[PDB]
Amino acid sequence: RPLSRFWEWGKNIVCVGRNYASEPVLFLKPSTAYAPEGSPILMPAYTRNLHHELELGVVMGKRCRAVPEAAAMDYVGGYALCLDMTARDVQDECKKKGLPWTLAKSFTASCPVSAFVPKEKIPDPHKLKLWLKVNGELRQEGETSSMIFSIPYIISYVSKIITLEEGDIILTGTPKGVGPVKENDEIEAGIHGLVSMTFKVEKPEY
Amino acid sequence: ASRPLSRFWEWGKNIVCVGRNYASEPVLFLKPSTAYAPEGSPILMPAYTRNLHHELELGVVMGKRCRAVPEAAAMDYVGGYALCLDMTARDVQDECKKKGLPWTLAKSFTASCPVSAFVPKEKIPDPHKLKLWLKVNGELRQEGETSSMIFSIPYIISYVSKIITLEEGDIILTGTPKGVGPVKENDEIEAGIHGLVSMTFKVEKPEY
Numbered sequence A: 001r002p003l004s005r006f007w008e009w010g011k012n013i014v015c016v017g018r019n020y021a022s023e024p025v026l027f028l029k030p031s032t033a034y035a036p037e038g039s040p041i042l043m044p045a046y047t048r049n050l051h052h053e054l055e056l057g058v059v060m061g062k063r064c065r066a067v068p069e070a071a072a073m074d075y076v077g078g079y080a081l082c083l084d085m086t087a088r089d090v091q092d093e094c095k096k097k098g099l100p101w102t103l104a105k106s107f108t109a110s111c112p113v114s115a116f117v118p119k120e121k122i123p124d125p126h127k128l129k130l131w132l133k134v135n136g137e138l139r140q141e142g143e144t145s146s147m148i149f150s151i152p153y154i155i156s157y158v159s160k161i162i163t164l165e166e167g168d169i170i171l172t173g174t175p176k177g178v179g180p181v182k183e184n185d186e187i188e189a190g191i192h193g194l195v196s197m198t199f200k201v202e203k204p205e206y
Numbered sequence B: 001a002s003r004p005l006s007r008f009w010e011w012g013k014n015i016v017c018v019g020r021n022y023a024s025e026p027v028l029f030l031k032p033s034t035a036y037a038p039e040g041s042p043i044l045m046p047a048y049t050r051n052l053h054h055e056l057e058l059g060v061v062m063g064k065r066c067r068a069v070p071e072a073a074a075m076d077y078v079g080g081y082a083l084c085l086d087m088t089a090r091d092v093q094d095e096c097k098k099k100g101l102p103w104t105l106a107k108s109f110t111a112s113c114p115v116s117a118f119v120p121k122e123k124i125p126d127p128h129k130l131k132l133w134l135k136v137n138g139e140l141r142q143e144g145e146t147s148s149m150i151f152s153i154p155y156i157i158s159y160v161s162k163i164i165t166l167e168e169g170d171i172i173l174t175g176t177p178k179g180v181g182p183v184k185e186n187d188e189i190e191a192g193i194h195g196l197v198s199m200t201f202k203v204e205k206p207e208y
């Protein structure tokens, strides 16, 4: 289907652990973690500390299996700005117990996502500037130039472990200033000169 | 438009697996859609493991968008079933557990969820009265009865659905009985549900 609405039909979401200040740590979100603009961030009932993580997402334009770094950028279709919503308290316990990160990282609406930005609009994804506000006040700022692992290497690396389909996305890590959000909070985020997006923290209607 | 559940592995977006469910709440982790290996495709061995285990599991293919459903309604959201193998780099898993890292390299690599033909819901009135088996070069290594599952199926559905909305075509593997063990290049795994379905897989290294 069309990359401009890739969150509607894309199957997989792969997320790098730390990529800002030896190999990347990888974890997954289900497709239902996607919350496109106009849809709320949903707070799980089991957390009392949900954090925002501002991240550049790389959307795969064709099927990508064990590709070398230099070819990796041919498999990219575009990009989207994401929040890797994280139940931080659950994560701390998972690290402690050797448990999978699912409840901390992989719940419904745990990946809010901007409009699709075609790769023609971004000649270099390592020269972008990211930002995020909670209730109008600046909280996360990062430059993608300060990423530890480059996007070509991240694509190559995960493609050698997990084949990526067209429409799959890779979240490439968060810069500094990660912190909490509560019910009714509003998160505004963007890439300077390219895209912006608004989201509202909300409880489920169960 | 709509694709058949008989080919759910072709279009299904998500795989959710339960940890220990045989002899307080389930452990959950995920595989990517590209973990699927339908019959005819090889179990691929990741180059970084020296201890790839099999795990015989009943899968549960969802038939209807399933968002935070109660246990008593859960079975209405099921489309059918498939027998799967939760292929696991156990050596990588131990290290993941130790460092408190994600289980991805252990449980979510390519071809790490071999899958049988789809069994419609009508053919299985009670999914807890099934018998599963698995052979490795002819030797019976896994034997389970789904009645001895700790968490029932309707609960597992009601539970994961509260955390993760499940689509049409998504599957939940409901854990593996005893008899888990390793495999190696050129081994031929066969496994089935008694009277319902059977499958065969060759273990290979990738043509990377």
Ligand SMILES: [Cl-]
Binding pocket: A027, A028, A099, A100, A101, A102, B029, B030, B101, B102, B103, B104
């Ligand atoms: Cl995990």
Ligand SMILES: [Mg+2]
Binding pocket: A011, A012, A013, A029, A030, A031, B013, B014, B015, B031, B032, B033
């Ligand atoms: Mg998926």
Ligand SMILES: [Mg+2]
Binding pocket: A015, A016, A017, A053, A055, A084, A173, A174
């Ligand atoms: Mg992150």
Ligand SMILES: [Mg+2]
Binding pocket: B017, B018, B019, B055, B057, B086, B173, B175, B176
């Ligand atoms: Mg398992």
